[PDB]
């Protein structure tokens, strides 16, 4: 998974990560990199 919630952004079907990861839409932990 990627970083957890707490960042400004609108979730697009997937949760809100607080730091874009290498991937794009793969989350397994808290919030997804919108």
Walkthrough of the structure:
The chain is mostly loops. The chain is 0% helix and 0% strand. It is globular, with a radius of gyration of 8 Å. It is classed as biosynthetic protein. The entry lists the keywords multi cyclic peptide, biosynthetic protein. It forms a monomeric assembly.
Strands, helices and their partners?
Layout: no helix or strand
Quick structural summary:
By secondary structure, the protein is mostly loops. The two termini are 13 Å apart.
The Cα radius of gyration reads 8 Å
**What percentage of the residues does DSSP assign to strands (E)?**
under 5%
Number of helix segments?
0
Number of strands: 0
For the termini, the CA-CA separation is 13 Å
Basic shape: globular
Helix amount: under 10%
> Can you summarize the main beta sheet?
none
Indicate the structural class: little secondary structure
Tags for this entry?
monomer; 34 residues; little secondary structure; 0% helix; globular; biosynthetic protein
């Amino acid at each position: 998974g990627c970083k957890p919630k707490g960042a400004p952004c609108s979730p697009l079907m997937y949760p809100c990560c607080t730091g874009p990861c290498p991937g794009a839409g793969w989350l397994m932990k808290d919030c997804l990199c919108c």
